[PDB]
Amino acid sequence: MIISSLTNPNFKVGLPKVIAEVCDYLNTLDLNALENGRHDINDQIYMNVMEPETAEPSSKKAELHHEYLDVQVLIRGTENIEVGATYPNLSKYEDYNEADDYQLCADIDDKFTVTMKPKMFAVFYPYEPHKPCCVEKIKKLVVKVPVKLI
Amino acid sequence: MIISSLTNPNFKVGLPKVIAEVCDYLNTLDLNALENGRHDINDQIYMNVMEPKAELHHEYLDVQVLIRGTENIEVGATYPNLSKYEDYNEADDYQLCADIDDKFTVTMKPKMFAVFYPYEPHKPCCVIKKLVVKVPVKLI
Ligand SMILES: [Cu+2]
Ligand SMILES: [Cu+2]
């Protein structure tokens, strides 16, 4: 997983090209005024933006994905995302939802919490578990990028 | 900053090549048998192995990997105010300050690795065997 900030003038060091181009593109936008909903960027890449409410961790399931990477960025507010960097125990995950490309699990092993501030972004590759929106209302966006583009 | 695990079948995904080659290399070793002290990998890369304020670097990135135990590391994803830092040590390539602005905690478990690029503030070893590979950013 990658954790970084669009605002850091060196955030592109190390980044896969496709991810660098989407971040360079997000830095062009009026992120504040972005409408809620789905926004297409490419044939391949879209993003969803929303104003959810942080909810207590035990109230929601972690997720992971098979086909897309996420680039999540926080726009307004502050948000916790529990994450695991070790490969999940798939035997413990719900059935794969193929239309929305995800599987759920009550919890993350070896989990730790990333605290997100405006313009911070996290990249979670496929099979990287994350439970975003953890503990109050925020604005955020997640970009969905096919991993085959890496 | 990157956070993964040497033992994840997918860890190379998106990884800069030089880092993938070092991780491959660590995977090649008995890490628990590793002698404490400085080992040189390449002509340009080496690592410190050890059994134990925030720091950042200019010319090197760190790959910090936990071998035994469990360690909390405080990190900042946001770019530091470079004024609140003590003067730059050139010999050892680091700058120190007491706290990281906008920081969070990464709990390392054996075989997890974390990559800190130049200017990513981190404060390792918070309440074990570990190593930290040193590699020049140029090679990225
Ligand atoms: Cu996701
Ligand atoms: Cu360091």
Swiss-Prot record, chain A:
Q: Look up the record and report any one GO term of the cellular component aspect.
A: cytosol
Q: Which compartments is it annotated to reside in? A: Cytoplasm
Q: Pfam families per the record? A: DUF386 (PF04074)
Q: Which cofactors go with this protein? A: Zn(2+)
What keywords is this UniProt entry annotated with? Copper, Cytoplasm, Metal-binding, Zinc
Q: How is the cofactor bound?
A: Has been crystallized with Cu(2+) but reconstitutes with Zn(2+).
The residues the record assigns to binding Cu cation are H65, D70, H130
Q: Which GO terms describe its molecular function?
A: metal ion binding
Q: Does the keyword RNA-binding apply?
A: no
Family from the record: Belongs to the NanQ anomerase family.
Q: What is this protein's function per UniProt?
A: Opens both the alpha- and beta-forms of N-acetylneuraminate (sialic acid; Neu5Ac) to provide aceneuramate, the preferred substrate for NanA. Has preferential activity on the beta-anomer rather than the alpha-anomer. Accelerates a reaction that is spontaneous at slightly alkaline pH, facilitates the reaction at acidic pH.
Protein name in the entry? N-acetylneuraminate anomerase
Query: What species was this sequence derived from?
Result: Haemophilus influenzae (strain ATCC 51907 / DSM 11121 / KW20 / Rd)
Curated annotation (Swiss-Prot), chain B:
InterPro entries per record: NanQ (IPR049827), NanQ/TabA/YiaL (IPR004375), NanQ/TabA/YiaL_sf (IPR037012)
Query: Cofactor binding mode, per the note?
Result: Has been crystallized with Cu(2+) but reconstitutes with Zn(2+).
The entry sums up its family as follows: Belongs to the NanQ anomerase family.
Report the function annotation for this chain: Opens both the alpha- and beta-forms of N-acetylneuraminate (sialic acid; Neu5Ac) to provide aceneuramate, the preferred substrate for NanA. Has preferential activity on the beta-anomer rather than the alpha-anomer. Accelerates a reaction that is spontaneous at slightly alkaline pH, facilitates the reaction at acidic pH.
- GO molecular-function annotation terms? metal ion binding
Report the locations given in the UniProt record: Cytoplasm
Indicate which residues the UniProt annotation says bind Cu cation: H57, D62, H122
Record's GO cellular component terms? cytosol
Q: Which PANTHER family does the record associate with it?
A: EVOLVED BETA-GALACTOSIDASE SUBUNIT BETA, N-ACETYLNEURAMINATE ANOMERASE NANQ
Its cofactor is: Zn(2+)
Q: What keywords would UniProt list here?
A: Copper, Cytoplasm, Metal-binding, Zinc
Name the predominant localization: cytoplasm
The UniProt entry, under Pfam families, shows: DUF386
Gene3D superfamilies, per database record: YhcH/YjgK/YiaL
Keyword Zinc applies: yes
**Catalysed reaction equations from the record:** N-acetyl-alpha-neuraminate = aceneuramate; N-acetyl-beta-neuraminate = aceneuramate
Q: Any idea what this protein is called?
A: N-acetylneuraminate anomerase
